[PDB]
Amino acid sequence: SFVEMVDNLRGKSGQGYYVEMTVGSPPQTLNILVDTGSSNFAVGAAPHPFLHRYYQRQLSSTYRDLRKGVYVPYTQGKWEGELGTDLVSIPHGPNVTVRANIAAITESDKFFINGSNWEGILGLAYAEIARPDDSLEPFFDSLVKQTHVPNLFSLQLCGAGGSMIIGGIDHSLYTGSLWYTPIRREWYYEVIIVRVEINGQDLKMDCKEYNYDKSIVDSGTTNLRLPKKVFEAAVKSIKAASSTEKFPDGFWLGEQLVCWQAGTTPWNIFPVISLYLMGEVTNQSFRITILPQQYLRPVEDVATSQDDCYKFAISQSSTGTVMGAVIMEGFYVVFDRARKRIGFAVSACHVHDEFRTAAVEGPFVTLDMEDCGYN
Template identity: 50%
Template structure:
C-alpha cells in the first residue's frame, strides 16, 4: 500500500511539471496585445492633390562635400532658425542638434521658438556608423526652397551624438525620407514628408539628383551639389526614359537585385545572395555596399579584368578593403582599364534593366588631405562589404536621376544630366529593357515572420495538448480521493468483518 501511494504521488508530480511546461508554452506564444497603438491616417487622398510645390525652385537646392553627404536648408520654429540637414532615404526621423558641440557651428534653440512643443519622449537612432539620442517634440518646418509650404511636424532634438556629426561638414541635422515603419522609437512618429503628403502639401513622390566631384554642380556655390524635388519630377535633372523597379517592401526603399555583372559578365551567383538581408536605395550611404561573398566575387572579377592588360598591376588588398588610397599623376588616371560594374534590376515580371556603373563612379576621389602629393589624383574604392545586405548608395546614385514614387510603389532610374568636368568621361548609363524570365520575388530575402493569426492557432493547439496532459491528473486525483473516502473505508471494514465472521463459523 505504501509503494502504491508513493507511485501515485510521483505520477501526480510528473503530470504537474508537464502541465506547467505546457501552460508556459501557451502563454509564451499567444499574441501580444499592442497598447496605445496610433492609427495611421489614410494618405492616399493627398497623392491626388496637385500641391503647392514649384519644382523649378528646387533645382540645385542640395549642397555637399566629398564623402560627407548632401544637405538641404530648412527653417525650424517661430521665428525661423535656419539649419542644414543631411538628406537620408535610409532613415525616417527629422533631427537637429539642440546643444553646441565642437563639430557644428550652430544649433536649434528651442526656448527661442514660440511654437516648439516637447513631448517628453526620448529617442535613440543608430546608423551603420554612429548614432544620436535626444528628445521628441514638434515645431513648424519650412523647406527654404519652397517657402510657401510650412507644416507642423515631428522633430527630434539631438542632445548627444557619437560619430555622427563631422567637423566643418556644414550640416547640423538629418532629414529622414524613409517610411514611418522605420521611424524611431516607433511608427507613431510621423516623418516630415508623410506629414506634408497627409496635409495635401505634396504628392506622394520625390526625386533626387546627386552630382559628385566629377561633375559640375547644379548649385554654382558649392563643389558638390544636387537637387531634392519634393512632390514630383522635374525635366532638368534627367534625359531619356525613366526605368521603374518595384519597391519590394515599404520601410526602407527595399528593391531586388536579380544579377550583378563585371564587364558585362555575370557573377553567376544565386540571386538571393545579392539581397541577403535586404537591398535598399540610400542617399545617406556613400558606397555601393554588398554582402561579403558578393563583394569578394566582384573584386575577384575586377582583378581578372585588370590582369588582361599586362601593363597594369592590380592594386593591393588595402585598396580593395578601403584602407588605402590609389594615386596616379594628375590627368593620367587609367579609367579605361577598369571594367564597368552593372546592377540588374527587374522592371516587371518579364523585363529588366541594367544600371551600368562606370569606373569614374566607383573610383571615388578623396580630398586633398589624403593625397600623397598635390600633383597626384588619389582615389578610394567605392564598393565595400556589409554584413546586413546591399546598399545602393551615393556613388551609384551620382550617375543617375532617382525617383522615389511611393504612390506607385516604384523606384525609377534615368540617365542624369549632371555635366562631367571631363568631357571625355565615360558616363554611367542605363541599358534596357532586357528580357527577364525569372521571378524576382524568389531573389528577395524573406525573413520568416509569424503573424498573430498563426500564433493564435498555435496557442489553441498547445492549449488542447495541455488539456490532454491535465486529464490524467484529474483521473488520478479522483482515484486518490476515492481511496481516502470514509465510506470506502467503512465498506472495507464491513467486508473484513464479514470475512472474519464467515471464517470463524
C-alpha cells in the same frame, strides 16, 4: 516651382548631401543631411565641437515638448535626443510650412562630421523603421498630410551638389527613358536586384544572393555595399581587370588611397558594373551601369592635391546590399511613393569619358521565373 528647387543640394558622397531647412518660429536655418536610409528628422540641439550652429528650442515660440526621449543607432554613429514638434520649412523646396516631429539631439557619438557643414538629418524612408517606433510620423508623411503636395520626391546627386525635387518629376534633370523598379516593402526603400554583371560578365549567382537579406537605396551612405559572397566576386573581377596596375596594401578594404599623376587616372583598366533591377512587368528588368568614375571616389585633400587620389568605394556589407551615394550619383532617381516604385534615368551630371558612359537601359527578359527577393 521645380525650377526654384533645382540646385538646392550641396555636399559630396563621402560626407553626404544636404539641403537648407528651417525650424521654429522665428525660423532658425540649418543644413540637413538628406537620408533615404532612415526615417527620423533630427537636429543638433546642443553645442558640439563639430557644429557651426544648432536648434535653440527656447527661442522658438511654436516649439512643443513631447516629453519623451529617442535613441537612434545607425551602422556607424548614434545620437540621443528629446522629441518635440515645431514648424519646419524648406526655403528652396516646396512653398509651404508644416508642423513635424523633431528629435532635438542632446548627446551623440560619431554622428556629426568635422567640416561636413550639416547640423541634422532628414530621414525620408517610411514609418516602419522610425525610432522609437512606427508611431512617430516621419517628416515627408507630415508634409504630404498637411499640404497635399504629391506623394513623391526625386534626387539628383552630383559628384565633382545636386537637386531634391518635391512633388513631381523635373524632366529638365534627365535624358532618355525613366525606368521603374518596384518598392518591395515600404520600410527602407527596398528594391530587388535580379542580375549583376561586371564588364559584361554575369556573376552567375542565384539572384537571391544579390538581395541577402535586403537591398536598399540609401543616400545617407557613401559606398556600394554588397553581401560577402557578392562583394568577394566583385573584387575578384575588378582586381583581374586592373591587374596591370599595382595597388597599395589595404586598397580593396576601402580605407587606403591610391593616387595617379594629375589627369592620368587609368579609368580604362577598371570594369563597369551593371546592376539589373526588377522591372514593373514580370521577368522584365533594366540595368543601371556604374563606371569607375563612380566607385573610385576622389578624396579632396589640399595636401595630396599635386595628384589625383581615390578610395575604393565598394564595401562588404552585413546589412544586405546598399546602393549608396556613389551609385545614385549621375542618375535622376525618383522616389515615387504614390505608386510604390523607384525610377532611374540618366541625369545631366552623369559620369562618362570618351569611351564609356553611365547608362539606364532596358527592357531585358529573363527565362527563369524565380523570385529574387530574399524574404
